[PDB]
Design a protein around this ligand. Structure first.
Ligand SMILES: *[C@@H]1O[C@H](CO)[C@@H](O)[C@H](O)[C@H]1NC(C)=O
Ligand SMILES: *[C@@H]1O[C@H](CO)[C@@H](O)[C@H](O)[C@H]1NC(C)=O
Ligand SMILES: *[C@@H]1O[C@H](CO)[C@@H](O)[C@H](O)[C@H]1NC(C)=O
Ligand SMILES: *[C@@H]1O[C@H](CO)[C@@H](O)[C@H](O)[C@H]1NC(C)=O
Ligand SMILES: *[C@@H]1O[C@H](CO)[C@@H](O)[C@H](O)[C@H]1NC(C)=O
Lengths: 379, 371
């Protein structure tokens, strides 16, 4: 077994905090004195993409592949996702990611982020929503939109569905809200990026639709980054979702070290709000460490220096160690900042919990999992 | 002398590649010879598409003709745009304004929305194929929101061949509980034929039902099997068999030897194939135009070079492609600055017991006209 496992790191715009969390998680792994928990040194090579288009991501992937990596940690978006998954699948190189979980059943992609559609559908069921506005962007895929459309057919819902991801001028959000208010619409499912959710809710408050007869369901796991103060005060209902419980030992342990870091070494740690994607990043390093510790114990061949040669070698002959690496990543069960971490055969999170919040401050109202569905607490 | 070009063809796109070859003969000219390098591949596989692109780039092509799908379109747009290599394609037009891509296929959205209004539908089912992409569904749902339509949107992608026949029957049973008799099919030729087969099997091709076939190849479908039941059927056609340009082409095409030209020897041509033939005209005309302007063009190395090295003459090629204006199998061919078809015509068809009938057309300058 090698002395060093080196991984790739593919970071995009707007992953500053995650990048700090990545480096800190690897430093937590490497500074452990217990040699049973730290039997190899973890190394990384990071590439920062000024943009995440297919050309730049292919370029980064290939140089990482050539330098020698045993797996790649990183981020994709709608523009880069297909290229990455296709290259990982052809070359048997495992990508581990906190990005939106993919639409397709794919190989060699470990998807740290749990799917949200099931929790969304259970809560629409619990609140008995049959008529509502659905505002969405496509930055996290089409899973939710497809699920909403399909559930509308099964349950005879009236969904007014409006794509909002291309709206640049805030007066268009105002026009949409005013038209829906004229149709007596009181229920909004917002399936957008956090920053777009913030834009929309500022318009809700400007127009006084943050009062008691309105209910905003926020379909985004970055609930704690959404600006909800002005909305709480008006009296509207708010429903949100999270995957981080700040009372779990793993989280209290991370946070007390994280708040002490020098911001010159770890930008956006210290007092900045911790994004769930940064917890997912930490969790990725737990998964990677566990898998390689597993491979060591079982005396499985992982190769001397990792991947080698040309990503556009023709024919493409995948290294033989790739399949065993993938299986080791996919079989882990660990407790992380985002709770119980396990994966199915397509690298989707399984046997996970989502915590459900409603507004008053904000209180946890219940939890959701795949087997129990939505479980509300007393009250 | 030669102008090397790339041809990226999906595996089994036989009729398209036949039409490409017929175009190469028909449009050959004294000023130059187009010399194609053909890769056949899995167009849904971005890795495969990236290898083919880079391979063409290194041989030193001046443009690439090809196809992409929802999964590989970001590969094509990103590499073409970075390296200033023009892509000409009959595939679904891209969602935004990507450079170095010329889109032979006219946009359908405008005509489809006008045709919904023309029949005064405000309540309908919409069967969409998630394997093909979702931007027409998004448009239809946005219009539904603006105009207060009630749309029952059902995904007919991701259907195992195992139970395709059974799934479609249950889909249409559920529609009859809601008493829904107006259905749009946002699918291409094969899947349209599959669904139509099941509609007939359960007897919903009868009077009192209306189907709109939302693709640019109305008569590419097997329409004869739904022509006698009594249901209304409507669609869109960009290839007009009454135009003399198209009937002249059909005289030769219908008499080609099928063994040498797979998919020929027929009285119709799929719109994809027709747009491919038209692409050979557009490319020929672009390079001839560069010569009329005395803009000299000769000179690519490593696909993944750092830094990216885009050739200077790329912009000139792009510009010449985008300035072309000709008549082809798909009508008047002209492009805006982002390579999208403009100034085009889409014929509106209804099926009758004596065959498909042209009832009008939709134009990109105005909207729906009855003829
Ligand atoms: C860490 O080392 C201690 C002391 O040797 C040992 O008891 C423990 O099992 C080791 N590994 C763990 C906790 O995973
Ligand atoms: C707000 O929440 C309550 C439960 O606390 C619910 O019964 C009520 O219907 C909600 N308001 C709207 C407008 O749906
Ligand atoms: C689910 O996770 C729990 C711990 O949260 C674990 O004990 C249990 O065995 C897991 N269940 C399955 C079916 O994997
Ligand atoms: C079939 O077409 C006629 C008009 O030609 C129309 O009156 C009828 O409503 C159509 N059928 C359906 C189900 O809409
Ligand atoms: C548009 O197309 C028509 C019909 O083919 C053609 O004759 C006309 O000159 C074109 N108009 C423009 C503005 O290019």
């Amino acid at each position: 077994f090698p002395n060093t496992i080196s991984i790739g790191g593919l970071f995009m715009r707007n992953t500053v905090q995650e990048h700090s969390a990545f480096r800190f998680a690897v430093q937590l792994y490497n500074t452990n004195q217990n040699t049973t928990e730290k039997p190899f040194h973890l190394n990384y090579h990071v590439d920062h993409l000024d943009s995440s288009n297919s050309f730049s991501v292919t370029n980064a992937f290939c140089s990482q592949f050539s330098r020698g990596v045993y797996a790649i940690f990183g981020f994709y978006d709608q523009m880069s996702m297909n290229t990455l998954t296709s290259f990982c699948g052809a070359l048997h190189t495992s990508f581990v990611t906190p990005s939106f979980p993919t639409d397709a059943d794919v190989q060699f992609v470990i998807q740290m982020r749990p799917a949200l559609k099931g929790a969304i559908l259970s809560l629409l069921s619990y609140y008995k929503w049959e008529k509502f506005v659905y505002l969405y962007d496509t930055e996290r895929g089409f899973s939710v939109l497809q699920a909403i459309m399909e559930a509308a057919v099964q349950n005879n819902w009236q969904v007014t569905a409006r794509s909002v991801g291309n709206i640049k001028d805030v007066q268009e959000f105002r026009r949409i809200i005013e038209e829906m208010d004229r149709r007596q619409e009181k229920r909004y499912l917002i399936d957008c990026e956090v920053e777009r959710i913030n834009t929309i809710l500022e318009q809700v408050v400007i127009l006084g639709k943050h009062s008691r007869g309105y209910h905003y369901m926020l379909a985004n796991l970055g609930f704690t980054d959404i600006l909800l103060e002005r909305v709480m005060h008006g009296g509207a209902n708010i429903t949100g979702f999270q995957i981080v419980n700040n009372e779990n030992p793993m989280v209290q342990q991370f946070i007390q070290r994280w708040v002490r870091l020098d911001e010159r070494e770890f930008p956006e740690a210290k007092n900045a709000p911790l994004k769930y994607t940064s917890a997912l990043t930490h969790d990725a390093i737990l998964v990677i460490a566990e898998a390689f510790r597993y491979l060591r114990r079982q005396r499985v061949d992982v190769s001397r220096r990792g991947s080698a040669g040309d990503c556009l070698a023709n024919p493409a002959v995948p290294w033989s160690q790739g399949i065993d690496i993938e299986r080791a990543l996919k079989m882990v069960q660990v407790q992380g900042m985002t709770g119980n971490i396990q994966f199915d055969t397509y690298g989707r999170r399984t046997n996970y919990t989502i915590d459900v919040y409603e507004m008053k401050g904000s209180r946890k109202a219940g939890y959701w999992n795949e087997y129990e569905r939505f479980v509300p607490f007393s009250g | 002398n030669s102008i090397q070009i790339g041809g990226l063809f999906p595996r089994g796109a036989d009729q398209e590649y036949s039409a490409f070859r017929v175009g190469m003969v028909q449009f050959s000219t004294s000023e130059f010879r187009l010399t194609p390098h053909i890769d056949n591949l899995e167009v849904a596989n971005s890795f495969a598409v990236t290898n083919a692109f880079c391979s063409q780039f290194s041989r030193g092509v001046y443009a690439i003709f090809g196809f992409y799908d929802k999964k590989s379109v970001n590969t094509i747009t990103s590499f073409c745009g970075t390296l200033h290599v023009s892509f000409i394609t009959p595939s679904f037009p891209t969602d935004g304004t990507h450079p170095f891509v010329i889109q032979m296929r006219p946009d359908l959205k405008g005509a489809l929305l006008s045709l919904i209004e023309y029949y005064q539908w405000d309540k309908f089912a919409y069967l969409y194929d998630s394997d093909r992409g979702l931007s027409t569904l998004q448009a239809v749902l946005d219009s539904a929101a603006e105009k207060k339509w009630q749309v029952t949107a059902i995904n007919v992608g991701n259907i195992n061949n195992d139970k395709k026949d059974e799934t479609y029957r249950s889909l249409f049973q559920d529609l009859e509980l809601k008493k829904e008799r107006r259905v749009i099919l946002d699918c291409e030729r094969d899947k349209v034929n599959d669904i139509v087969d099941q509609v007939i099997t359960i007897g919903k091709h009868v009077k009192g039902y209306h189907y709109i076939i939302a693709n640019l190849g109305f008569t590419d479908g097997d329409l004869l099997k739904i022509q006698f039941g009594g249901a209304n059927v409507s669609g869109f056609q960009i290839v007009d068999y009454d135009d003399s340009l198209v009937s002249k082409f059909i005289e030769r095409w219908s008499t080609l030897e099928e063994k040498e030209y797979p998919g020929a020897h027929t009285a119709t041509i799929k719109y994809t194939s027709a747009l491919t033939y038209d692409a050979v005209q557009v490319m020929t005309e672009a390079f001839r135009n560069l010569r009329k302007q005395r803009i000299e063009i000769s000179r690519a190395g490593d696909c993944l070079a750092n830094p990216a090295v885009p050739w200077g003459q790329g912009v000139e090629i792009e510009r010449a492609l985008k300035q072309v204006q000709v008549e082809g199998l798909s009508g008047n061919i002209k492009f805006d600055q982002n390579g999208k078809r403009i100034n085009y015509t889409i014929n509106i068809m209804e099926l009758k017991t004596n065959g498909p009938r042209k009832i009008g057309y939709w134009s990109e300058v105005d909207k729906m006209v009855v003829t």
